[PDB]
Amino acid sequence: FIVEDDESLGHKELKVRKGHIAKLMATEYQDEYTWSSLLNEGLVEYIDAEEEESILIAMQPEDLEPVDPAKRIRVSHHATTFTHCEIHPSMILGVAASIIPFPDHNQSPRNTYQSAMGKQAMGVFLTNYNVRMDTMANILYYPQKPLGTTRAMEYLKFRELPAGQNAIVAIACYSGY
Amino acid sequence: FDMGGYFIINGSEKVLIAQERSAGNIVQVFKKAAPSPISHVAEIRSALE
Amino acid sequence: TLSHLRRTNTPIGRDGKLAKPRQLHNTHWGLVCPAETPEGQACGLVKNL
């Protein structure tokens, strides 16, 4: 997201607004306004590693621009010269890492091991497995989507093509096996 | 759901993996080790588009 | 499937040896998945967008 003043009334604010969000929603539920249009009107800017040098990026669309003990401690805004803002910091994860529930709440190598194991997780690769003739294919009898779903999964199609099952787990040592 | 973006050669689905490499047309300086007489060597991988 | 399609490969030799490029440099943020990677000889070299 682009962070310019664009507001003589006061402090900095994101160029994108609720009107643009409503238009994007309307185009979504229609099937005119889409990411091409956002790029043309310069609401969102493509930024590379080299150009990241010269820009100060805000954490959240509202948290930095202007308390429950249980809530995450976040460092207060210190600078008042932001130029971009993260669309969502959850979008730094990859495919296999966007399937982990609550990656924040894990020790990082254990996110790595899951991201490796998701590839070999059983599921439903494609819907034409009967038509195809693959050397090695595994299909779960009853694929089930995660109860602890993630919003990235609606775009990753994990809900439509799950890889795993929801099982009732009891964390205990019953017989030592 | 299949998003394509792969080849099919003799019915085997083949994917080309992005080959990371040093960027072209950039000047990079590196410090060198003491035993070598070279110190602070600059390198450029000049390339035509 | 999607992981392989977005996978990236570094041409540095896979043989076990000390290497700066095997770390997750700060500039990898948001362009390379900081968690997804193979584990073993290829760890850190293979990267996923």
Partner: peptide, 30 residues
């Protein structure tokens, strides 16, 4: 109302726009 501030929940709509109009394999296709 049209010029109201955006929220983090609304950023997901922008993300959906990205994913609809490019997709995951977009760089390879392009």
């Amino acid at each position: 109302d049209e010029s109201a501030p955006i929220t983090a929940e609304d950023s997901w709509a922008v993300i959906s726009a990205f994913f609809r109009e490019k997709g995951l394999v977009s760089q390879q296709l392009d």
